[PDB]
Amino acid sequence: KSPEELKGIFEKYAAKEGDPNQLSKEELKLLLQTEFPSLLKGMSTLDELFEELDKNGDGEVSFEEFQVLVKKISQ
Ligand SMILES: [La+3]
């Protein structure tokens, strides 16, 4: 629940596919799946979440960008 576990879990998923130093659509998908499937129900589709989360115009949703979703995960 805490952030500490979020980091671990995050890496556990980021390490799944590709470098764990960079998140991916498919990667996040899984996470968003177990991590927070309710967020998937939101009006923000994957693509939207992918593009939305990714604001560093790179392609990686590093933990940094993750803190952005933490907002929606807070509400
Ligand atoms: La990025």
JSON list of N, CA and C and ligand atoms in Angstrom, two decimals:
[
{"chain": "A", "resi": 1, "resn": "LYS", "atom": "N", "xyz": [0.84, -1.18, 0.00]},
{"chain": "A", "resi": 1, "resn": "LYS", "atom": "CA", "xyz": [0.00, 0.00, 0.00]},
{"chain": "A", "resi": 1, "resn": "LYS", "atom": "C", "xyz": [0.89, 1.25, 0.00]},
{"chain": "A", "resi": 2, "resn": "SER", "atom": "N", "xyz": [1.87, 1.24, 0.89]},
{"chain": "A", "resi": 2, "resn": "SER", "atom": "CA", "xyz": [2.79, 2.36, 1.00]},
{"chain": "A", "resi": 2, "resn": "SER", "atom": "C", "xyz": [3.52, 2.57, -0.33]},
{"chain": "A", "resi": 3, "resn": "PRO", "atom": "N", "xyz": [4.35, 3.64, -0.36]},
{"chain": "A", "resi": 3, "resn": "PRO", "atom": "CA", "xyz": [5.11, 3.97, -1.56]},
{"chain": "A", "resi": 3, "resn": "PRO", "atom": "C", "xyz": [6.29, 3.00, -1.73]},
{"chain": "A", "resi": 4, "resn": "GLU", "atom": "N", "xyz": [6.87, 2.62, -0.61]},
{"chain": "A", "resi": 4, "resn": "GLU", "atom": "CA", "xyz": [8.00, 1.71, -0.62]},
{"chain": "A", "resi": 4, "resn": "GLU", "atom": "C", "xyz": [7.66, 0.45, -1.43]},
{"chain": "A", "resi": 5, "resn": "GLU", "atom": "N", "xyz": [6.49, -0.10, -1.13]},
{"chain": "A", "resi": 5, "resn": "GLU", "atom": "CA", "xyz": [6.04, -1.30, -1.82]},
{"chain": "A", "resi": 5, "resn": "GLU", "atom": "C", "xyz": [5.74, -0.99, -3.28]},
{"chain": "A", "resi": 6, "resn": "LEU", "atom": "N", "xyz": [5.33, 0.25, -3.52]},
{"chain": "A", "resi": 6, "resn": "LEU", "atom": "CA", "xyz": [5.01, 0.68, -4.87]},
{"chain": "A", "resi": 6, "resn": "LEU", "atom": "C", "xyz": [6.27, 0.63, -5.74]},
{"chain": "A", "resi": 7, "resn": "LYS", "atom": "N", "xyz": [7.37, 1.07, -5.14]},
{"chain": "A", "resi": 7, "resn": "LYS", "atom": "CA", "xyz": [8.64, 1.08, -5.84]},
{"chain": "A", "resi": 7, "resn": "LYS", "atom": "C", "xyz": [9.02, -0.35, -6.23]},
{"chain": "A", "resi": 8, "resn": "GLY", "atom": "N", "xyz": [8.99, -1.23, -5.23]},
{"chain": "A", "resi": 8, "resn": "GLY", "atom": "CA", "xyz": [9.33, -2.62, -5.44]},
{"chain": "A", "resi": 8, "resn": "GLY", "atom": "C", "xyz": [8.42, -3.25, -6.51]},
{"chain": "A", "resi": 9, "resn": "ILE", "atom": "N", "xyz": [7.12, -3.16, -6.26]},
{"chain": "A", "resi": 9, "resn": "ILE", "atom": "CA", "xyz": [6.15, -3.71, -7.19]},
{"chain": "A", "resi": 9, "resn": "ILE", "atom": "C", "xyz": [6.40, -3.13, -8.59]},
{"chain": "A", "resi": 10, "resn": "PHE", "atom": "N", "xyz": [6.56, -1.82, -8.63]},
{"chain": "A", "resi": 10, "resn": "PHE", "atom": "CA", "xyz": [6.81, -1.14, -9.89]},
{"chain": "A", "resi": 10, "resn": "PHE", "atom": "C", "xyz": [7.96, -1.80, -10.66]},
{"chain": "A", "resi": 11, "resn": "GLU", "atom": "N", "xyz": [9.09, -1.91, -9.98]},
{"chain": "A", "resi": 11, "resn": "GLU", "atom": "CA", "xyz": [10.26, -2.52, -10.59]},
{"chain": "A", "resi": 11, "resn": "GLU", "atom": "C", "xyz": [9.97, -3.98, -10.96]},
{"chain": "A", "resi": 12, "resn": "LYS", "atom": "N", "xyz": [9.19, -4.63, -10.11]},
{"chain": "A", "resi": 12, "resn": "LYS", "atom": "CA", "xyz": [8.83, -6.02, -10.34]},
{"chain": "A", "resi": 12, "resn": "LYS", "atom": "C", "xyz": [8.11, -6.14, -11.68]},
{"chain": "A", "resi": 13, "resn": "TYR", "atom": "N", "xyz": [7.46, -5.06, -12.06]},
{"chain": "A", "resi": 13, "resn": "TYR", "atom": "CA", "xyz": [6.72, -5.03, -13.32]},
{"chain": "A", "resi": 13, "resn": "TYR", "atom": "C", "xyz": [7.57, -4.42, -14.44]},
{"chain": "A", "resi": 14, "resn": "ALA", "atom": "N", "xyz": [8.31, -3.38, -14.08]},
{"chain": "A", "resi": 14, "resn": "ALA", "atom": "CA", "xyz": [9.17, -2.70, -15.03]},
{"chain": "A", "resi": 14, "resn": "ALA", "atom": "C", "xyz": [10.29, -3.65, -15.47]},
{"chain": "A", "resi": 15, "resn": "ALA", "atom": "N", "xyz": [10.59, -4.60, -14.60]},
{"chain": "A", "resi": 15, "resn": "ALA", "atom": "CA", "xyz": [11.64, -5.57, -14.88]},
{"chain": "A", "resi": 15, "resn": "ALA", "atom": "C", "xyz": [11.06, -6.70, -15.74]},
{"chain": "A", "resi": 16, "resn": "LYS", "atom": "N", "xyz": [9.74, -6.82, -15.69]},
{"chain": "A", "resi": 16, "resn": "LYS", "atom": "CA", "xyz": [9.05, -7.85, -16.45]},
{"chain": "A", "resi": 16, "resn": "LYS", "atom": "C", "xyz": [9.45, -7.73, -17.92]},
{"chain": "A", "resi": 17, "resn": "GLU", "atom": "N", "xyz": [9.05, -6.62, -18.53]},
{"chain": "A", "resi": 17, "resn": "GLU", "atom": "CA", "xyz": [9.35, -6.38, -19.93]},
{"chain": "A", "resi": 17, "resn": "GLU", "atom": "C", "xyz": [10.26, -5.16, -20.07]},
{"chain": "A", "resi": 18, "resn": "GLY", "atom": "N", "xyz": [11.34, -5.35, -20.81]},
{"chain": "A", "resi": 18, "resn": "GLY", "atom": "CA", "xyz": [12.30, -4.28, -21.03]},
{"chain": "A", "resi": 18, "resn": "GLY", "atom": "C", "xyz": [12.96, -3.85, -19.71]},
{"chain": "A", "resi": 19, "resn": "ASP", "atom": "N", "xyz": [13.83, -2.86, -19.82]},
{"chain": "A", "resi": 19, "resn": "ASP", "atom": "CA", "xyz": [14.54, -2.36, -18.66]},
{"chain": "A", "resi": 19, "resn": "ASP", "atom": "C", "xyz": [13.52, -1.86, -17.63]},
{"chain": "A", "resi": 20, "resn": "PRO", "atom": "N", "xyz": [13.79, -2.21, -16.34]},
{"chain": "A", "resi": 20, "resn": "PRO", "atom": "CA", "xyz": [12.90, -1.81, -15.26]},
{"chain": "A", "resi": 20, "resn": "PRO", "atom": "C", "xyz": [13.08, -0.33, -14.92]},
{"chain": "A", "resi": 21, "resn": "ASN", "atom": "N", "xyz": [13.98, 0.31, -15.67]},
{"chain": "A", "resi": 21, "resn": "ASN", "atom": "CA", "xyz": [14.26, 1.72, -15.46]},
{"chain": "A", "resi": 21, "resn": "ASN", "atom": "C", "xyz": [13.32, 2.55, -16.34]},
{"chain": "A", "resi": 22, "resn": "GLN", "atom": "N", "xyz": [12.54, 1.84, -17.15]},
{"chain": "A", "resi": 22, "resn": "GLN", "atom": "CA", "xyz": [11.60, 2.50, -18.04]},
{"chain": "A", "resi": 22, "resn": "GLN", "atom": "C", "xyz": [10.34, 1.65, -18.20]},
{"chain": "A", "resi": 23, "resn": "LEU", "atom": "N", "xyz": [9.20, 2.27, -17.89]},
{"chain": "A", "resi": 23, "resn": "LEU", "atom": "CA", "xyz": [7.93, 1.58, -18.00]},
{"chain": "A", "resi": 23, "resn": "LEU", "atom": "C", "xyz": [7.45, 1.63, -19.45]},
{"chain": "A", "resi": 24, "resn": "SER", "atom": "N", "xyz": [6.51, 0.74, -19.76]},
{"chain": "A", "resi": 24, "resn": "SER", "atom": "CA", "xyz": [5.96, 0.67, -21.10]},
{"chain": "A", "resi": 24, "resn": "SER", "atom": "C", "xyz": [4.44, 0.50, -21.04]},
{"chain": "A", "resi": 25, "resn": "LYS", "atom": "N", "xyz": [3.80, 0.72, -22.18]},
{"chain": "A", "resi": 25, "resn": "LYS", "atom": "CA", "xyz": [2.36, 0.59, -22.26]},
{"chain": "A", "resi": 25, "resn": "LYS", "atom": "C", "xyz": [1.94, -0.80, -21.79]},
{"chain": "A", "resi": 26, "resn": "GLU", "atom": "N", "xyz": [2.48, -1.80, -22.46]},
{"chain": "A", "resi": 26, "resn": "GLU", "atom": "CA", "xyz": [2.17, -3.18, -22.12]},
{"chain": "A", "resi": 26, "resn": "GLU", "atom": "C", "xyz": [2.56, -3.47, -20.67]},
{"chain": "A", "resi": 27, "resn": "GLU", "atom": "N", "xyz": [3.72, -2.97, -20.29]},
{"chain": "A", "resi": 27, "resn": "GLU", "atom": "CA", "xyz": [4.21, -3.16, -18.93]},
{"chain": "A", "resi": 27, "resn": "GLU", "atom": "C", "xyz": [3.23, -2.56, -17.92]},
{"chain": "A", "resi": 28, "resn": "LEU", "atom": "N", "xyz": [2.93, -1.28, -18.12]},
{"chain": "A", "resi": 28, "resn": "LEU", "atom": "CA", "xyz": [2.02, -0.58, -17.24]},
{"chain": "A", "resi": 28, "resn": "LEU", "atom": "C", "xyz": [0.66, -1.29, -17.25]},
{"chain": "A", "resi": 29, "resn": "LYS", "atom": "N", "xyz": [0.25, -1.69, -18.44]},
{"chain": "A", "resi": 29, "resn": "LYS", "atom": "CA", "xyz": [-1.02, -2.38, -18.60]},
{"chain": "A", "resi": 29, "resn": "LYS", "atom": "C", "xyz": [-1.16, -3.44, -17.50]},
{"chain": "A", "resi": 30, "resn": "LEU", "atom": "N", "xyz": [-0.18, -4.32, -17.43]},
{"chain": "A", "resi": 30, "resn": "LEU", "atom": "CA", "xyz": [-0.19, -5.38, -16.44]},
{"chain": "A", "resi": 30, "resn": "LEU", "atom": "C", "xyz": [-0.36, -4.76, -15.05]},
{"chain": "A", "resi": 31, "resn": "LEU", "atom": "N", "xyz": [0.56, -3.87, -14.71]},
{"chain": "A", "resi": 31, "resn": "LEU", "atom": "CA", "xyz": [0.52, -3.20, -13.42]},
{"chain": "A", "resi": 31, "resn": "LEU", "atom": "C", "xyz": [-0.89, -2.64, -13.19]},
{"chain": "A", "resi": 32, "resn": "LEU", "atom": "N", "xyz": [-1.26, -1.69, -14.04]},
{"chain": "A", "resi": 32, "resn": "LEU", "atom": "CA", "xyz": [-2.57, -1.07, -13.94]},
{"chain": "A", "resi": 32, "resn": "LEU", "atom": "C", "xyz": [-3.64, -2.15, -13.80]},
{"chain": "A", "resi": 33, "resn": "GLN", "atom": "N", "xyz": [-3.29, -3.34, -14.27]},
{"chain": "A", "resi": 33, "resn": "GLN", "atom": "CA", "xyz": [-4.21, -4.47, -14.20]},
{"chain": "A", "resi": 33, "resn": "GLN", "atom": "C", "xyz": [-4.41, -4.91, -12.75]},
{"chain": "A", "resi": 34, "resn": "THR", "atom": "N", "xyz": [-3.30, -5.30, -12.13]},
{"chain": "A", "resi": 34, "resn": "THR", "atom": "CA", "xyz": [-3.34, -5.75, -10.74]},
{"chain": "A", "resi": 34, "resn": "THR", "atom": "C", "xyz": [-3.24, -4.55, -9.80]},
{"chain": "A", "resi": 35, "resn": "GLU", "atom": "N", "xyz": [-2.24, -3.72, -10.05]},
{"chain": "A", "resi": 35, "resn": "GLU", "atom": "CA", "xyz": [-2.02, -2.54, -9.23]},
{"chain": "A", "resi": 35, "resn": "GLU", "atom": "C", "xyz": [-3.34, -1.79, -9.01]},
{"chain": "A", "resi": 36, "resn": "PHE", "atom": "N", "xyz": [-3.93, -1.36, -10.12]},
{"chain": "A", "resi": 36, "resn": "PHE", "atom": "CA", "xyz": [-5.18, -0.63, -10.06]},
{"chain": "A", "resi": 36, "resn": "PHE", "atom": "C", "xyz": [-6.00, -0.84, -11.34]},
{"chain": "A", "resi": 37, "resn": "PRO", "atom": "N", "xyz": [-6.85, -1.90, -11.31]},
{"chain": "A", "resi": 37, "resn": "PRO", "atom": "CA", "xyz": [-7.68, -2.22, -12.46]},
{"chain": "A", "resi": 37, "resn": "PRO", "atom": "C", "xyz": [-8.85, -1.24, -12.58]},
{"chain": "A", "resi": 38, "resn": "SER", "atom": "N", "xyz": [-9.17, -0.62, -11.45]},
{"chain": "A", "resi": 38, "resn": "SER", "atom": "CA", "xyz": [-10.27, 0.34, -11.42]},
{"chain": "A", "resi": 38, "resn": "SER", "atom": "C", "xyz": [-9.92, 1.56, -12.27]},
{"chain": "A", "resi": 39, "resn": "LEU", "atom": "N", "xyz": [-8.63, 1.87, -12.31]},
{"chain": "A", "resi": 39, "resn": "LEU", "atom": "CA", "xyz": [-8.15, 3.01, -13.08]},
{"chain": "A", "resi": 39, "resn": "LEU", "atom": "C", "xyz": [-8.32, 2.71, -14.57]},
{"chain": "A", "resi": 40, "resn": "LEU", "atom": "N", "xyz": [-8.40, 1.43, -14.88]},
{"chain": "A", "resi": 40, "resn": "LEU", "atom": "CA", "xyz": [-8.56, 1.00, -16.26]},
{"chain": "A", "resi": 40, "resn": "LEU", "atom": "C", "xyz": [-9.99, 1.27, -16.71]},
{"chain": "A", "resi": 41, "resn": "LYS", "atom": "N", "xyz": [-10.90, 1.26, -15.74]},
{"chain": "A", "resi": 41, "resn": "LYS", "atom": "CA", "xyz": [-12.30, 1.50, -16.02]},
{"chain": "A", "resi": 41, "resn": "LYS", "atom": "C", "xyz": [-12.50, 2.97, -16.38]},
{"chain": "A", "resi": 42, "resn": "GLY", "atom": "N", "xyz": [-11.72, 3.82, -15.73]},
{"chain": "A", "resi": 42, "resn": "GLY", "atom": "CA", "xyz": [-11.80, 5.25, -15.97]},
{"chain": "A", "resi": 42, "resn": "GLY", "atom": "C", "xyz": [-11.96, 5.55, -17.46]},
{"chain": "A", "resi": 43, "resn": "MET", "atom": "N", "xyz": [-12.34, 6.79, -17.74]},
{"chain": "A", "resi": 43, "resn": "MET", "atom": "CA", "xyz": [-12.53, 7.21, -19.12]},
{"chain": "A", "resi": 43, "resn": "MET", "atom": "C", "xyz": [-11.19, 7.34, -19.85]},
{"chain": "A", "resi": 44, "resn": "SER", "atom": "N", "xyz": [-10.12, 7.14, -19.09]},
{"chain": "A", "resi": 44, "resn": "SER", "atom": "CA", "xyz": [-8.78, 7.23, -19.65]},
{"chain": "A", "resi": 44, "resn": "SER", "atom": "C", "xyz": [-8.32, 5.85, -20.12]},
{"chain": "A", "resi": 45, "resn": "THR", "atom": "N", "xyz": [-8.46, 5.62, -21.41]},
{"chain": "A", "resi": 45, "resn": "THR", "atom": "CA", "xyz": [-8.06, 4.35, -22.00]},
{"chain": "A", "resi": 45, "resn": "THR", "atom": "C", "xyz": [-6.55, 4.15, -21.87]},
{"chain": "A", "resi": 46, "resn": "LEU", "atom": "N", "xyz": [-6.11, 2.95, -22.19]},
{"chain": "A", "resi": 46, "resn": "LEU", "atom": "CA", "xyz": [-4.69, 2.62, -22.11]},
{"chain": "A", "resi": 46, "resn": "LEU", "atom": "C", "xyz": [-3.89, 3.69, -22.85]},
{"chain": "A", "resi": 47, "resn": "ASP", "atom": "N", "xyz": [-4.13, 3.78, -24.15]},
{"chain": "A", "resi": 47, "resn": "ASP", "atom": "CA", "xyz": [-3.44, 4.75, -24.98]},
{"chain": "A", "resi": 47, "resn": "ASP", "atom": "C", "xyz": [-3.41, 6.10, -24.25]},
{"chain": "A", "resi": 48, "resn": "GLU", "atom": "N", "xyz": [-4.58, 6.53, -23.83]},
{"chain": "A", "resi": 48, "resn": "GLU", "atom": "CA", "xyz": [-4.70, 7.80, -23.13]},
{"chain": "A", "resi": 48, "resn": "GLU", "atom": "C", "xyz": [-3.76, 7.83, -21.92]},
{"chain": "A", "resi": 49, "resn": "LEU", "atom": "N", "xyz": [-3.81, 6.75, -21.15]},
{"chain": "A", "resi": 49, "resn": "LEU", "atom": "CA", "xyz": [-2.97, 6.63, -19.97]},
{"chain": "A", "resi": 49, "resn": "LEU", "atom": "C", "xyz": [-1.50, 6.62, -20.39]},
{"chain": "A", "resi": 50, "resn": "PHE", "atom": "N", "xyz": [-1.22, 5.86, -21.43]},
{"chain": "A", "resi": 50, "resn": "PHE", "atom": "CA", "xyz": [0.13, 5.75, -21.94]},
{"chain": "A", "resi": 50, "resn": "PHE", "atom": "C", "xyz": [0.67, 7.12, -22.37]},
{"chain": "A", "resi": 51, "resn": "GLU", "atom": "N", "xyz": [-0.10, 7.78, -23.22]},
{"chain": "A", "resi": 51, "resn": "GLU", "atom": "CA", "xyz": [0.28, 9.09, -23.72]},
{"chain": "A", "resi": 51, "resn": "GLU", "atom": "C", "xyz": [0.20, 10.13, -22.59]},
{"chain": "A", "resi": 52, "resn": "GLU", "atom": "N", "xyz": [-0.84, 9.99, -21.78]},
{"chain": "A", "resi": 52, "resn": "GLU", "atom": "CA", "xyz": [-1.05, 10.90, -20.67]},
{"chain": "A", "resi": 52, "resn": "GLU", "atom": "C", "xyz": [0.12, 10.81, -19.69]},
{"chain": "A", "resi": 53, "resn": "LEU", "atom": "N", "xyz": [0.36, 9.60, -19.21]},
{"chain": "A", "resi": 53, "resn": "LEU", "atom": "CA", "xyz": [1.44, 9.37, -18.27]},
{"chain": "A", "resi": 53, "resn": "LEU", "atom": "C", "xyz": [2.76, 9.86, -18.88]},
{"chain": "A", "resi": 54, "resn": "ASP", "atom": "N", "xyz": [3.02, 9.40, -20.09]},
{"chain": "A", "resi": 54, "resn": "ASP", "atom": "CA", "xyz": [4.23, 9.78, -20.79]},
{"chain": "A", "resi": 54, "resn": "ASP", "atom": "C", "xyz": [4.12, 11.24, -21.24]},
{"chain": "A", "resi": 55, "resn": "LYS", "atom": "N", "xyz": [4.79, 12.11, -20.49]},
{"chain": "A", "resi": 55, "resn": "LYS", "atom": "CA", "xyz": [4.77, 13.53, -20.80]},
{"chain": "A", "resi": 55, "resn": "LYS", "atom": "C", "xyz": [6.20, 14.00, -21.07]},
{"chain": "A", "resi": 56, "resn": "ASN", "atom": "N", "xyz": [7.14, 13.07, -20.95]},
{"chain": "A", "resi": 56, "resn": "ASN", "atom": "CA", "xyz": [8.54, 13.38, -21.18]},
{"chain": "A", "resi": 56, "resn": "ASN", "atom": "C", "xyz": [8.89, 13.06, -22.64]},
{"chain": "A", "resi": 57, "resn": "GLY", "atom": "N", "xyz": [7.85, 12.83, -23.43]},
{"chain": "A", "resi": 57, "resn": "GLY", "atom": "CA", "xyz": [8.04, 12.52, -24.84]},
{"chain": "A", "resi": 57, "resn": "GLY", "atom": "C", "xyz": [9.28, 11.65, -25.04]},
{"chain": "A", "resi": 58, "resn": "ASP", "atom": "N", "xyz": [9.22, 10.45, -24.48]},
{"chain": "A", "resi": 58, "resn": "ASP", "atom": "CA", "xyz": [10.33, 9.51, -24.60]},
{"chain": "A", "resi": 58, "resn": "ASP", "atom": "C", "xyz": [9.79, 8.13, -24.96]},
{"chain": "A", "resi": 59, "resn": "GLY", "atom": "N", "xyz": [8.90, 7.64, -24.11]},
{"chain": "A", "resi": 59, "resn": "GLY", "atom": "CA", "xyz": [8.30, 6.33, -24.32]},
{"chain": "A", "resi": 59, "resn": "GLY", "atom": "C", "xyz": [8.36, 5.49, -23.05]},
{"chain": "A", "resi": 60, "resn": "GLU", "atom": "N", "xyz": [9.02, 6.04, -22.04]},
{"chain": "A", "resi": 60, "resn": "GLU", "atom": "CA", "xyz": [9.16, 5.35, -20.77]},
{"chain": "A", "resi": 60, "resn": "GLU", "atom": "C", "xyz": [8.35, 6.06, -19.68]},
{"chain": "A", "resi": 61, "resn": "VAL", "atom": "N", "xyz": [7.59, 5.28, -18.94]},
{"chain": "A", "resi": 61, "resn": "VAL", "atom": "CA", "xyz": [6.77, 5.82, -17.87]},
{"chain": "A", "resi": 61, "resn": "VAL", "atom": "C", "xyz": [7.46, 5.56, -16.52]},
{"chain": "A", "resi": 62, "resn": "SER", "atom": "N", "xyz": [8.72, 5.96, -16.45]},
{"chain": "A", "resi": 62, "resn": "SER", "atom": "CA", "xyz": [9.49, 5.77, -15.23]},
{"chain": "A", "resi": 62, "resn": "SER", "atom": "C", "xyz": [8.64, 6.13, -14.01]},
{"chain": "A", "resi": 63, "resn": "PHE", "atom": "N", "xyz": [9.13, 5.72, -12.85]},
{"chain": "A", "resi": 63, "resn": "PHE", "atom": "CA", "xyz": [8.42, 6.00, -11.60]},
{"chain": "A", "resi": 63, "resn": "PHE", "atom": "C", "xyz": [8.03, 7.47, -11.51]},
{"chain": "A", "resi": 64, "resn": "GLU", "atom": "N", "xyz": [8.88, 8.32, -12.08]},
{"chain": "A", "resi": 64, "resn": "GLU", "atom": "CA", "xyz": [8.64, 9.75, -12.07]},
{"chain": "A", "resi": 64, "resn": "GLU", "atom": "C", "xyz": [7.23, 10.05, -12.57]},
{"chain": "A", "resi": 65, "resn": "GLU", "atom": "N", "xyz": [6.93, 9.55, -13.76]},
{"chain": "A", "resi": 65, "resn": "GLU", "atom": "CA", "xyz": [5.63, 9.75, -14.36]},
{"chain": "A", "resi": 65, "resn": "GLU", "atom": "C", "xyz": [4.55, 9.03, -13.56]},
{"chain": "A", "resi": 66, "resn": "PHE", "atom": "N", "xyz": [4.97, 7.94, -12.92]},
{"chain": "A", "resi": 66, "resn": "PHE", "atom": "CA", "xyz": [4.05, 7.15, -12.12]},
{"chain": "A", "resi": 66, "resn": "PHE", "atom": "C", "xyz": [3.42, 8.00, -11.01]},
{"chain": "A", "resi": 67, "resn": "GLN", "atom": "N", "xyz": [4.23, 8.89, -10.45]},
{"chain": "A", "resi": 67, "resn": "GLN", "atom": "CA", "xyz": [3.77, 9.76, -9.39]},
{"chain": "A", "resi": 67, "resn": "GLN", "atom": "C", "xyz": [2.61, 10.63, -9.88]},
{"chain": "A", "resi": 68, "resn": "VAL", "atom": "N", "xyz": [2.45, 10.65, -11.19]},
{"chain": "A", "resi": 68, "resn": "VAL", "atom": "CA", "xyz": [1.38, 11.44, -11.80]},
{"chain": "A", "resi": 68, "resn": "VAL", "atom": "C", "xyz": [0.06, 10.69, -11.64]},
{"chain": "A", "resi": 69, "resn": "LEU", "atom": "N", "xyz": [0.13, 9.38, -11.79]},
{"chain": "A", "resi": 69, "resn": "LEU", "atom": "CA", "xyz": [-1.05, 8.54, -11.67]},
{"chain": "A", "resi": 69, "resn": "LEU", "atom": "C", "xyz": [-1.42, 8.40, -10.20]},
{"chain": "A", "resi": 70, "resn": "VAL", "atom": "N", "xyz": [-0.40, 8.45, -9.35]},
{"chain": "A", "resi": 70, "resn": "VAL", "atom": "CA", "xyz": [-0.61, 8.33, -7.92]},
{"chain": "A", "resi": 70, "resn": "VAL", "atom": "C", "xyz": [-1.68, 9.32, -7.48]},
{"chain": "A", "resi": 71, "resn": "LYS", "atom": "N", "xyz": [-1.85, 10.36, -8.29]},
{"chain": "A", "resi": 71, "resn": "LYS", "atom": "CA", "xyz": [-2.84, 11.38, -8.00]},
{"chain": "A", "resi": 71, "resn": "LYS", "atom": "C", "xyz": [-4.24, 10.80, -8.16]},
{"chain": "A", "resi": 72, "resn": "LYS", "atom": "N", "xyz": [-4.45, 10.13, -9.29]},
{"chain": "A", "resi": 72, "resn": "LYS", "atom": "CA", "xyz": [-5.73, 9.52, -9.59]},
{"chain": "A", "resi": 72, "resn": "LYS", "atom": "C", "xyz": [-5.95, 8.33, -8.65]},
{"chain": "A", "resi": 73, "resn": "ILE", "atom": "N", "xyz": [-4.85, 7.70, -8.28]},
{"chain": "A", "resi": 73, "resn": "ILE", "atom": "CA", "xyz": [-4.90, 6.55, -7.40]},
{"chain": "A", "resi": 73, "resn": "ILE", "atom": "C", "xyz": [-5.18, 7.02, -5.97]},
{"chain": "A", "resi": 74, "resn": "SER", "atom": "N", "xyz": [-5.07, 8.33, -5.78]},
{"chain": "A", "resi": 74, "resn": "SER", "atom": "CA", "xyz": [-5.31, 8.92, -4.48]},
{"chain": "A", "resi": 74, "resn": "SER", "atom": "C", "xyz": [-6.78, 9.30, -4.33]},
{"chain": "A", "resi": 75, "resn": "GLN", "atom": "N", "xyz": [-7.32, 9.87, -5.40]},
{"chain": "A", "resi": 75, "resn": "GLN", "atom": "CA", "xyz": [-8.72, 10.28, -5.40]},
{"chain": "A", "resi": 75, "resn": "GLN", "atom": "C", "xyz": [-9.63, 9.06, -5.42]},
{"chain": "B", "resi": 1, "resn": "LA", "atom": "LA", "xyz": [9.07, 9.44, -19.93]}
]
